[PDB]
Every structure is written in C-alpha cells, then in structure tokens.
Amino acid sequence: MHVFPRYAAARPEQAAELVRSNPFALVVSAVDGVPVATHAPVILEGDAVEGGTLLGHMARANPHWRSFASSPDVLVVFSGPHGYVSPTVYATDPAVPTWDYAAVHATGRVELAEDALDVVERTVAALEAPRDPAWTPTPASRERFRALLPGVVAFRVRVRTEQSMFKLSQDLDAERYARVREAFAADNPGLADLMDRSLE
Amino acid sequence: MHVFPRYAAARPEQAAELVRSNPFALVVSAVDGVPVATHAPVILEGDAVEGGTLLGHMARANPHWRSFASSPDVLVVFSGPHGYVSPTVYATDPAVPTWDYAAVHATGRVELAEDALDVVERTVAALEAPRDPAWTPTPASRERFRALLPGVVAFRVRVRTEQSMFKLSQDLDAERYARVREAFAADNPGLADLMDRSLE
Ligand code: HEM
Ligand code: HEM
C-alpha cells in the first residue's frame, strides 16, 4: 500500500480507531514462498498501532499457523468501509472512476500465544463493546469456551511498522464531494459515517 | 485460508460470481521478504477463476509493482459481503461468536501488462455492468484516460491455484439460521442477499 499524502489520516488516532472498529482482518504470511492469508478477528493492545501488539486466533485445523515458526514475518490488514465511486455520481465530464476506502496495515513478528483463552475472551469483549445490546458470556458459555479451546490457535504480533490510508474523496471540490457523500449516504451508510467522522 | 468443507460453495460458478461482483481486491506479494498488499480493482478473464487470468492496475507512484519482477508470486484476495455473528442473535446459551464471509483467493505469476489502456477500459466496463444506470465513457473521457495513462501500471496474473469459501451459517439448524438471516436483512442486506443467493 502506498499512502498518497492527500489521503493521509487527518488525526493520528484515526488508525487505531479503524483497527478497533474493523477487527475482521486479513493475516498474511509466506508459506513455501507464496503469500497465504487467513480471515480472522484480530484485536489491538496499546493506545496506538505503532508500539502496539495485535492478538488473534484461527482454527487449529487451519494449517496456516504451522508456518509461523519458519516464516514469522506477518502483515495484518484491517479494512474499513469502502465503496466504488462511479462517474455517474460526479455528473461531470470528462471523468475517471475510483474506489474509496480506509485501511490500516501493520507488519511484525508473529508468535504463538499460549494464553488462548485470554485472547478469545478479550476478542469477545472487543467485538461486543460497540454493540447495543452487548453479549456477555454466561458461566455456561465460558465452560463451553474451555471445551472449544483445543481446536483454536491464538497468536500475537508485535507491530514493527504501520501505515494507514483514508481515501475518502476529501481531495474533491465541495460540489463533487457533496455528490459523493450523498450517494453513499443512501447506498453505504458505514462509509458515509466514516467520511463524516473523518471531517469532525 | 483453510476451506472448511461445511462452508464450500454449493455450486462451482459461485467463485467467479463473487470475483466479478467484488472486484476491489487485495493484491499481495513479498517485498524484501515481508508481504505487502495493495488495494486495487482486479477483473477476471475466463469463465472460471481456475484457468483464468486476472487483470488489474495501480498507481505508477505506488512502488509495489516494482517488486514484481524479482518477487513474482502473487496472491489476490477477493472479499465479498461479511458480518459479525453475535450470540445475541442466536438467543441460545451456551454460545460462541463467529464471523460470516465469502472470499476467493487466487495465486499465480504476475506480469506487467503493456496494454494498460485496455486493462483500465475493461475495468470500467466490468465495474459499471452491474449498475443501473451505468456510465459509459464519452470521447472526452477516453481522451482524458490517454492523458492519465502515464501514471498507471497495469498487470496480469495467470491463475495457478484458487480456493473459495462461503462461510454463511449454512451449518446451523433452521431456527438459528433464520435468526442470523433476519438480523442481517436489516443490518447488512448485501450479506443477506448473498446468503439467499447461496440457497437458490
Ligand atoms: C467475537 C469473537 C469471535 C469471532 C469473531 C470468531 C471468529 C472465528 C473465525 C472466523 C474462525 C475461523 C478461523 C479460520 O479460518 O481458521 C474461528 C475459529 C474458531 N474459533 Fe473463534 N471467534 C470468536 C471467538 C471465539 C471464542 C470465544 C472461542 C472459544 C474457544 C473460539 C473458538 C474457536 C474455534 C474452536 C475455532 C475453530 C473451529 C473449527 O475448527 O471449525 N472463538 N473463529
Ligand atoms: C472502475 C474503474 C476504476 C477504479 C475502481 C479505479 C481505482 C483506482 C485506485 C483504487 C487507484 C489507487 C491504486 C494504488 O493505490 O496504487 C487507482 C490509481 C490510478 N488509476 Fe484507476 N481506477 C479505475 C479506472 C481507471 C481508468 C479508466 C484510468 C485511466 C487511465 C485510471 C487511471 C489511474 C491512475 C492514473 C492512477 C494513479 C493516480 C495517482 O498517481 O494518484 N483508472 N485507480
């Protein structure tokens, strides 16, 4: 990912906000020289992605984690709201299409996490926190977590590098920007809300 | 990505349908040994992902494409609709959360595409095809495409391997499945439509 300066975050806190708000990430490493990726929930420990640690889990039956010891460089991609920008919306000619999106990429050293129960329970808490109502696990559910635990592999990534981009049409003139924002308001409220929040 | 058999596509055509319907992909390769990923629109040439060719573009100012010659193994990830499944929705105890999603991963050899104008114009056609109304480029827009062309790098991937997963709660009993489907109907119609289409 190349971060074009015109799409840099306006505030440094935006990157960790995106990460916390979009935890279903892509965990990428090399296996036999080819990138392989697993879709998995990953949470952040730390006030920032830089200097932070990421914690996730996958199925033990997914062999991806077995390659971590010999190929430990990982990339984790967090993808926020996104949407195609058609020239139909611009209503200007000549025009070129684009795609709007926000993302945070973090790279670092992966290690298997022995404290898998703590990782999955903290993942529950982080993914339920923005919900209304939120689910909290009963003792019976926690007992079931202990029965499920042999089938899970948890992991930690100490973040070495990080980048973020908020490609949200903010380089447009006010007239076309309003057209883009209003078209997403109806078709993609998550992206429209991200645009609004990235202006307040 | 490990494809759990219970989440395999019901029909072989579903993978290419997902790819065509979700062209904003993640293009991943190794650069200095670490995975790096660019978010870019990628289209499919062929009736299937297997035996197919993928075609995309990125900015010339994005240095990712410069690593293609020495590290040519690429992974392209197409991500369809997705959404968190909270135990709140199940209304059963004990429970464990999950995430529902569909994705197609394709790996192969990348090569730079000399026919960049054709790649970007076919990308316009593919991304406008499902829209109503669709935008077609006027001669003035095509003239502008020619002025923009020096700033773009196009590329091709001959697909060597492919996998797809449709993790859409279809392993649940009818009662919980209806609860999941109805909760997404209101909060995530794209995912609910994908679930429905993956049942017809
Ligand atoms: C919000 C919380 C959670 C989410 C979104 C989530 C999501 C997921 C996903 C997407 C997978 C598949 C990973 C892969 O492809 O390898 C998975 C696997 C798994 N998770 Fe979680 N999970 C959550 C919490 C938990 C908890 C609390 C436990 C308790 C131990 C748990 C146990 C497991 C197990 C056993 C598997 C493997 C199942 C199998 O082999 O089919 N997860 N989870
Ligand atoms: C539906 C069609 C299209 C979509 C969704 C799209 C999307 C994108 C995206 C996401 C990027 C940034 C890539 C990166 O991060 O490296 C990009 C770059 C670029 N695209 Fe496209 N594009 C489309 C069609 C076109 C067409 C028809 C042209 C005409 C030549 C074009 C020319 C360019 C150029 C010049 C750049 C680089 C701009 C810069 O350096 O800032 N694109 N496009």
Coordinates of C-alpha atoms and ligand atoms in Angstrom, one line a residue:
Chain A
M1 CA 0.0 0.0 0.0
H2 CA 1.3 3.4 -1.0
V3 CA -0.2 6.2 1.2
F4 CA -0.8 9.1 -1.1
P5 CA -0.4 12.3 1.1
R6 CA -3.8 13.7 0.1
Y7 CA -5.4 10.6 1.7
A8 CA -3.4 10.6 5.0
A9 CA -5.3 10.5 8.2
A10 CA -6.2 14.0 9.5
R11 CA -5.6 12.8 13.1
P12 CA -3.1 10.2 14.4
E13 CA -5.8 8.5 16.5
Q14 CA -7.8 7.5 13.3
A15 CA -5.7 4.5 12.6
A16 CA -6.3 2.7 15.9
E17 CA -10.0 3.8 15.7
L18 CA -10.3 2.0 12.4
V19 CA -8.5 -1.1 13.7
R20 CA -10.7 -1.3 16.8
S21 CA -13.8 -0.7 14.7
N22 CA -12.9 -3.3 11.9
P23 CA -11.4 -6.3 13.7
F24 CA -12.1 -8.9 11.0
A25 CA -8.7 -8.7 9.5
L26 CA -6.5 -10.5 6.9
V27 CA -3.5 -12.2 8.4
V28 CA -0.8 -12.7 5.7
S29 CA 2.5 -14.6 5.7
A30 CA 4.6 -16.5 3.3
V31 CA 4.2 -20.3 3.1
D32 CA 6.5 -22.1 0.7
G33 CA 7.4 -18.7 -0.7
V34 CA 3.8 -17.7 -1.7
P35 CA 1.7 -15.4 0.4
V36 CA -1.2 -17.1 2.2
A37 CA -3.9 -15.2 4.0
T38 CA -6.5 -16.1 6.7
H39 CA -9.5 -14.1 7.6
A40 CA -9.6 -13.8 11.4
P41 CA -10.6 -11.4 14.2
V42 CA -7.6 -9.5 15.5
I43 CA -7.6 -7.0 18.4
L44 CA -5.2 -4.3 19.4
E45 CA -3.3 -4.0 22.7
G46 CA -2.0 -0.4 23.1
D47 CA -3.2 3.1 22.5
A48 CA -1.7 3.1 19.0
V49 CA -1.0 0.6 16.3
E50 CA 2.7 1.7 16.4
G51 CA 4.2 0.3 19.5
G52 CA 1.2 -2.0 19.8
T53 CA 0.6 -5.7 19.9
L54 CA -2.1 -7.5 17.8
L55 CA -3.8 -10.6 19.1
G56 CA -5.8 -13.1 17.1
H57 CA -6.9 -16.7 16.7
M58 CA -7.7 -19.2 13.9
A59 CA -8.7 -22.8 13.8
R60 CA -6.1 -25.4 14.8
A61 CA -7.3 -27.3 11.7
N62 CA -6.2 -24.3 9.5
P63 CA -2.6 -25.2 8.8
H64 CA -1.6 -21.5 8.2
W65 CA -0.4 -21.2 11.8
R66 CA 2.1 -24.1 11.4
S67 CA 4.2 -22.0 9.0
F68 CA 4.6 -19.2 11.6
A69 CA 7.8 -20.6 13.2
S70 CA 9.8 -20.8 9.9
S71 CA 8.1 -17.8 8.2
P72 CA 7.4 -15.4 11.0
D73 CA 7.1 -12.1 9.1
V74 CA 3.4 -11.2 9.0
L75 CA 1.2 -8.5 7.6
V76 CA -2.2 -7.8 9.1
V77 CA -4.6 -5.8 7.0
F78 CA -7.6 -4.0 8.6
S79 CA -10.1 -2.9 6.1
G80 CA -12.8 -0.3 7.0
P81 CA -15.8 0.8 4.9
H82 CA -15.2 1.1 1.2
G83 CA -17.2 1.7 -2.0
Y84 CA -16.9 2.2 -5.7
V85 CA -17.1 5.9 -6.9
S86 CA -18.8 5.9 -10.3
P87 CA -18.5 8.9 -12.6
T88 CA -22.3 8.8 -12.6
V89 CA -22.1 10.3 -9.2
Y90 CA -19.7 13.1 -10.2
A91 CA -22.0 14.2 -13.0
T92 CA -19.0 15.9 -14.6
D93 CA -17.3 15.1 -17.8
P94 CA -14.5 14.1 -18.6
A95 CA -14.3 11.8 -15.6
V96 CA -12.4 8.8 -14.3
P97 CA -13.7 6.2 -11.7
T98 CA -12.1 5.4 -8.4
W99 CA -12.7 3.4 -5.2
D100 CA -12.9 4.9 -1.7
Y101 CA -11.7 3.1 1.3
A102 CA -9.9 3.2 4.6
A103 CA -7.3 0.7 5.7
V104 CA -4.5 0.1 8.2
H105 CA -1.6 -2.3 7.5
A106 CA 0.6 -3.5 10.3
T107 CA 3.7 -5.7 9.9
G108 CA 5.7 -7.5 12.6
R109 CA 6.9 -10.7 14.2
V110 CA 4.2 -13.4 14.9
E111 CA 4.4 -15.7 17.8
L112 CA 2.0 -18.4 19.0
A113 CA 0.1 -17.3 22.1
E114 CA -0.1 -19.8 24.9
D115 CA -2.9 -17.8 26.6
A116 CA -5.5 -18.7 24.0
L117 CA -8.5 -18.5 26.4
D118 CA -7.5 -14.9 27.3
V119 CA -7.1 -14.0 23.7
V120 CA -10.5 -15.3 22.7
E121 CA -12.2 -13.8 25.7
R122 CA -10.7 -10.4 25.1
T123 CA -11.8 -10.7 21.5
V124 CA -15.4 -11.3 22.7
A125 CA -15.2 -8.1 24.8
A126 CA -13.7 -6.0 22.0
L127 CA -16.3 -7.1 19.4
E128 CA -19.3 -6.8 21.7
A129 CA -18.2 -3.4 23.1
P130 CA -19.6 -1.3 20.2
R131 CA -22.9 -3.2 20.2
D132 CA -26.2 -2.3 21.8
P133 CA -27.1 -4.6 23.5
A134 CA -23.8 -6.3 24.1
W135 CA -23.5 -10.1 24.8
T136 CA -21.6 -11.2 27.8
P137 CA -20.7 -14.8 28.3
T138 CA -22.6 -16.7 31.0
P139 CA -20.6 -19.2 33.1
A140 CA -22.1 -22.0 30.8
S141 CA -20.6 -20.2 27.8
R142 CA -17.3 -19.8 29.5
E143 CA -17.4 -23.6 30.3
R144 CA -18.1 -24.2 26.6
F145 CA -15.1 -21.9 25.6
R146 CA -12.9 -24.2 27.7
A147 CA -14.3 -27.2 25.8
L148 CA -13.7 -25.5 22.4
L149 CA -10.1 -24.4 23.3
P150 CA -8.2 -27.4 22.0
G151 CA -9.4 -26.5 18.5
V152 CA -8.1 -23.0 18.5
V153 CA -4.6 -21.5 17.9
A154 CA -4.0 -17.9 19.2
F155 CA -1.2 -15.7 18.1
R156 CA 0.4 -12.3 18.9
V157 CA 2.1 -9.8 16.5
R158 CA 4.5 -7.2 17.9
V159 CA 4.0 -4.3 15.5
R160 CA 7.2 -3.2 13.7
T161 CA 5.7 -1.0 11.0
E162 CA 2.4 0.5 10.3
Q163 CA 0.7 2.6 7.7
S164 CA -2.9 3.9 7.2
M165 CA -4.8 5.5 4.4
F166 CA -8.2 7.2 4.4
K167 CA -9.0 7.5 0.7
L168 CA -12.4 9.3 1.1
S169 CA -12.7 11.8 -1.7
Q170 CA -11.5 14.7 0.5
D171 CA -9.4 16.0 -2.4
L172 CA -12.5 16.8 -4.4
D173 CA -14.1 20.2 -4.8
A174 CA -17.0 20.9 -2.4
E175 CA -19.7 20.3 -5.1
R176 CA -18.4 16.9 -6.2
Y177 CA -17.6 16.0 -2.6
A178 CA -21.2 16.6 -1.6
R179 CA -22.4 14.4 -4.5
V180 CA -20.1 11.5 -3.5
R181 CA -21.2 11.8 0.2
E182 CA -24.8 12.0 -0.6
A183 CA -24.7 9.0 -2.9
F184 CA -23.1 6.9 -0.2
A185 CA -25.5 8.2 2.5
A186 CA -28.2 6.1 0.8
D187 CA -26.2 3.2 -0.5
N188 CA -23.4 2.7 2.1
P189 CA -24.1 4.5 5.5
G190 CA -21.0 2.9 7.1
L191 CA -18.8 4.6 4.5
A192 CA -20.7 7.9 4.7
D193 CA -20.4 7.8 8.5
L194 CA -16.6 7.2 8.2
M195 CA -16.4 10.2 5.8
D196 CA -18.4 12.4 8.3
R197 CA -16.3 11.3 11.3
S198 CA -13.1 12.0 9.2
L199 CA -14.3 15.6 9.0
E200 CA -15.4 16.4 12.5
Chain B
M1 CA -7.3 -19.7 4.1
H2 CA -8.4 -23.2 5.1
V3 CA -11.7 -24.1 3.4
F4 CA -13.8 -26.0 6.0
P5 CA -15.9 -28.4 3.9
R6 CA -19.2 -27.3 5.6
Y7 CA -18.5 -23.8 4.0
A8 CA -17.6 -24.9 0.5
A9 CA -19.5 -23.4 -2.4
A10 CA -22.7 -25.2 -3.3
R11 CA -22.1 -24.6 -7.0
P12 CA -18.8 -24.2 -8.8
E13 CA -19.9 -21.0 -10.5
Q14 CA -20.2 -19.2 -7.2
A15 CA -16.5 -18.4 -7.0
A16 CA -16.3 -16.5 -10.3
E17 CA -19.6 -14.8 -9.5
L18 CA -18.1 -13.5 -6.2
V19 CA -15.0 -12.3 -8.0
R20 CA -16.9 -10.4 -10.7
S21 CA -19.2 -8.9 -8.0
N22 CA -16.4 -7.8 -5.7
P23 CA -13.6 -6.5 -7.8
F24 CA -11.9 -4.3 -5.2
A25 CA -9.3 -6.8 -4.3
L26 CA -6.1 -7.1 -2.3
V27 CA -3.0 -7.8 -4.4
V28 CA -0.3 -9.4 -2.2
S29 CA 3.3 -10.2 -2.9
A30 CA 6.6 -10.3 -1.0
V31 CA 8.9 -7.2 -0.9
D32 CA 12.2 -7.7 0.9
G33 CA 10.7 -10.9 2.3
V34 CA 7.7 -9.3 4.0
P35 CA 4.2 -9.4 2.5
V36 CA 3.0 -6.1 1.1
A37 CA -0.6 -5.6 -0.2
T38 CA -2.2 -3.0 -2.4
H39 CA -6.0 -2.4 -2.6
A40 CA -6.8 -2.3 -6.3
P41 CA -9.6 -3.2 -8.8
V42 CA -9.0 -6.6 -10.4
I43 CA -11.1 -8.2 -13.1
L44 CA -11.4 -11.8 -14.4
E45 CA -10.8 -13.0 -17.9
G46 CA -12.3 -16.5 -18.3
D47 CA -15.4 -18.4 -17.3
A48 CA -13.7 -19.6 -14.1
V49 CA -11.1 -18.4 -11.7
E50 CA -9.2 -21.7 -12.4
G51 CA -7.6 -21.5 -15.8
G52 CA -8.4 -17.8 -15.7
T53 CA -6.3 -14.6 -15.9
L54 CA -6.7 -11.6 -13.5
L55 CA -6.1 -8.1 -14.7
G56 CA -5.6 -5.0 -12.5
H57 CA -3.9 -1.7 -12.2
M58 CA -2.3 0.5 -9.6
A59 CA -0.6 3.9 -9.5
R60 CA 2.8 4.1 -11.0
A61 CA 3.7 6.1 -7.9
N62 CA 2.9 3.1 -5.8
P63 CA 6.3 1.2 -5.7
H64 CA 4.7 -2.2 -5.1
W65 CA 4.7 -3.0 -8.8
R66 CA 8.5 -2.5 -9.0
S67 CA 9.0 -5.7 -6.9
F68 CA 7.0 -7.9 -9.3
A69 CA 10.0 -8.8 -11.5
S70 CA 12.1 -10.2 -8.6
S71 CA 9.2 -11.5 -6.4
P72 CA 6.5 -12.5 -8.9
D73 CA 4.4 -14.9 -6.8
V74 CA 1.2 -13.1 -6.1
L75 CA -1.9 -13.7 -4.1
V76 CA -5.1 -11.9 -5.0
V77 CA -7.9 -11.9 -2.4
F78 CA -11.5 -11.1 -3.3
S79 CA -13.7 -10.4 -0.3
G80 CA -17.4 -10.4 -0.6
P81 CA -20.0 -9.3 2.0
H82 CA -19.2 -10.2 5.6
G83 CA -20.5 -9.6 9.1
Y84 CA -20.0 -10.4 12.7
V85 CA -22.4 -13.0 14.2
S86 CA -23.1 -12.2 17.8
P87 CA -24.5 -14.7 20.2
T88 CA -27.2 -12.0 20.9
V89 CA -28.7 -13.1 17.5
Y90 CA -28.6 -16.8 18.3
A91 CA -30.5 -16.3 21.5
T92 CA -29.2 -19.7 22.7
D93 CA -26.9 -20.5 25.5
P94 CA -24.1 -21.6 25.7
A95 CA -22.9 -19.8 22.6
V96 CA -19.7 -18.8 20.8
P97 CA -19.4 -15.9 18.4
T98 CA -18.3 -16.1 14.8
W99 CA -17.8 -14.1 11.6
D100 CA -19.6 -14.8 8.3
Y101 CA -18.0 -14.0 5.0
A102 CA -17.3 -15.2 1.5
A103 CA -13.9 -14.9 -0.2
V104 CA -12.0 -16.2 -3.2
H105 CA -8.2 -16.4 -3.1
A106 CA -6.2 -16.9 -6.3
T107 CA -2.4 -17.3 -6.6
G108 CA -0.2 -17.1 -9.7
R109 CA 2.6 -15.5 -11.7
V110 CA 2.3 -11.7 -12.1
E111 CA 3.5 -9.9 -15.2
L112 CA 3.3 -6.2 -16.1
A113 CA 0.7 -5.5 -18.8
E114 CA 1.8 -3.4 -21.7
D115 CA -1.9 -2.9 -22.8
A116 CA -2.7 -0.6 -19.8
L117 CA -5.4 1.3 -21.6
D118 CA -7.3 -1.9 -22.5
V119 CA -7.0 -3.1 -18.9
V120 CA -8.4 0.1 -17.4
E121 CA -11.2 0.4 -20.0
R122 CA -12.2 -3.3 -19.4
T123 CA -12.2 -2.4 -15.7
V124 CA -14.6 0.4 -16.4
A125 CA -16.9 -1.9 -18.3
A126 CA -16.8 -4.6 -15.6
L127 CA -17.5 -2.3 -12.7
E128 CA -20.3 -0.4 -14.5
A129 CA -22.0 -3.5 -15.8
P130 CA -24.0 -4.3 -12.5
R131 CA -25.1 -0.7 -12.1
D132 CA -28.3 1.0 -13.1
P133 CA -27.7 3.4 -14.7
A134 CA -24.2 2.5 -16.0
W135 CA -21.7 5.1 -17.0
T136 CA -20.1 4.8 -20.4
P137 CA -17.0 7.0 -21.2
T138 CA -17.6 9.8 -23.7
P139 CA -14.8 10.5 -26.2
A140 CA -13.7 13.3 -23.9
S141 CA -13.3 10.9 -21.0
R142 CA -11.4 8.5 -23.3
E143 CA -9.1 11.3 -24.3
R144 CA -8.6 12.0 -20.6
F145 CA -7.8 8.3 -20.0
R146 CA -5.0 8.7 -22.5
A147 CA -3.7 11.7 -20.6
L148 CA -3.8 9.8 -17.3
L149 CA -2.2 6.6 -18.7
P150 CA 1.5 7.5 -17.9
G151 CA 0.6 7.4 -14.2
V152 CA -0.8 3.9 -14.2
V153 CA 0.8 0.5 -14.2
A154 CA -1.4 -2.5 -15.2
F155 CA -0.6 -6.1 -14.5
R156 CA -1.8 -9.7 -15.3
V157 CA -1.9 -12.8 -13.1
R158 CA -2.2 -16.2 -14.7
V159 CA -4.1 -18.1 -12.0
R160 CA -2.2 -21.2 -10.8
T161 CA -4.3 -22.1 -7.7
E162 CA -7.6 -21.0 -6.4
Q163 CA -9.8 -21.6 -3.4
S164 CA -13.1 -20.2 -2.2
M165 CA -15.1 -20.2 1.0
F166 CA -18.7 -19.3 1.6
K167 CA -18.9 -19.2 5.4
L168 CA -22.6 -18.2 5.7
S169 CA -24.1 -20.0 8.7
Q170 CA -25.5 -22.8 6.5
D171 CA -24.3 -25.4 9.1
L172 CA -26.9 -24.0 11.6
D173 CA -30.2 -25.5 12.5
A174 CA -33.2 -23.9 10.7
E175 CA -34.2 -21.9 13.8
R176 CA -30.9 -20.2 14.4
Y177 CA -30.3 -19.9 10.7
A178 CA -33.5 -17.9 10.3
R179 CA -32.4 -15.7 13.2
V180 CA -29.0 -14.9 11.6
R181 CA -30.5 -14.3 8.2
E182 CA -33.2 -11.9 9.6
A183 CA -30.6 -10.0 11.7
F184 CA -28.5 -9.3 8.6
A185 CA -31.6 -8.5 6.5
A186 CA -31.9 -5.3 8.5
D187 CA -28.2 -4.5 9.2
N188 CA -26.4 -5.9 6.1
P189 CA -28.6 -6.5 3.1
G190 CA -25.6 -7.3 0.9
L191 CA -24.7 -10.2 3.1
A192 CA -28.3 -11.3 3.5
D193 CA -28.7 -11.3 -0.3
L194 CA -25.5 -13.4 -0.7
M195 CA -27.0 -15.9 1.8
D196 CA -30.2 -16.0 -0.1
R197 CA -28.5 -16.4 -3.5
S198 CA -26.3 -19.2 -2.0
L199 CA -29.6 -21.1 -1.3
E200 CA -31.5 -20.7 -4.6
Ligands
HEM1 C1 -16.1 -12.2 18.6 C2 -15.5 -13.3 18.9 C3 -15.1 -14.4 17.8 C4 -15.1 -14.3 16.5 C5 -15.5 -13.2 15.5 C6 -14.6 -15.6 16.0 C7 -14.4 -16.0 14.7 C8 -13.8 -17.1 14.2 C9 -13.4 -17.4 12.8 C10 -13.7 -16.5 11.6 C11 -12.9 -18.7 12.8 C12 -12.3 -19.4 11.6 C13 -10.8 -19.2 11.6 C14 -10.0 -19.9 10.4 O1 -10.5 -19.8 9.3 O2 -9.0 -20.6 10.7 C15 -12.8 -19.1 14.2 C16 -12.4 -20.4 14.6 C17 -12.5 -20.9 15.8 N1 -12.8 -20.2 17.0 FE1 -13.4 -18.3 17.0 N2 -14.3 -16.4 17.0 C18 -14.6 -15.7 18.2 C19 -14.5 -16.1 19.5 C20 -14.1 -17.4 19.9 C21 -14.2 -17.9 21.2 C22 -14.6 -17.1 22.5 C23 -13.8 -19.2 21.2 C24 -13.7 -20.1 22.4 C25 -12.7 -21.1 22.5 C26 -13.5 -19.6 19.8 C27 -13.1 -20.8 19.3 C28 -12.9 -21.1 18.0 C29 -12.6 -22.4 17.5 C30 -12.6 -23.7 18.3 C31 -12.4 -22.3 16.2 C32 -12.1 -23.5 15.2 C33 -13.4 -24.2 14.8 C34 -13.2 -25.2 13.7 O3 -12.2 -25.9 13.8 O4 -14.1 -25.3 12.8 N3 -13.7 -18.4 19.0 N4 -13.4 -18.2 15.0
HEM2 C1 -13.8 1.3 -12.3 C2 -12.7 1.7 -12.7 C3 -11.5 2.2 -11.8 C4 -11.3 2.1 -10.5 C5 -12.2 1.4 -9.4 C6 -10.0 2.6 -10.2 C7 -9.4 2.7 -8.9 C8 -8.1 3.1 -8.7 C9 -7.4 3.0 -7.4 C10 -8.0 2.4 -6.1 C11 -6.2 3.6 -7.5 C12 -5.1 3.7 -6.5 C13 -4.1 2.4 -6.7 C14 -2.9 2.4 -5.8 O1 -3.1 2.6 -4.6 O2 -1.8 2.3 -6.3 C15 -6.1 4.0 -8.9 C16 -5.0 4.6 -9.5 C17 -5.0 5.2 -10.7 N1 -5.8 4.9 -11.7 FE1 -7.6 3.9 -11.6 N2 -9.5 3.1 -11.3 C18 -10.3 2.9 -12.4 C19 -10.2 3.2 -13.7 C20 -9.1 4.0 -14.2 C21 -9.0 4.4 -15.6 C22 -10.1 4.2 -16.7 C23 -7.9 5.1 -15.7 C24 -7.4 5.8 -16.9 C25 -6.1 5.8 -17.2 C26 -7.2 5.1 -14.4 C27 -6.0 5.7 -14.0 C28 -5.4 5.7 -12.8 C29 -4.3 6.5 -12.4 C30 -3.5 7.5 -13.3 C31 -4.0 6.2 -11.2 C32 -2.8 6.8 -10.3 C33 -3.2 8.1 -9.8 C34 -2.2 8.7 -8.8 O3 -1.0 8.5 -9.1 O4 -2.6 9.3 -7.8 N3 -8.0 4.4 -13.5 N4 -7.3 3.7 -9.6

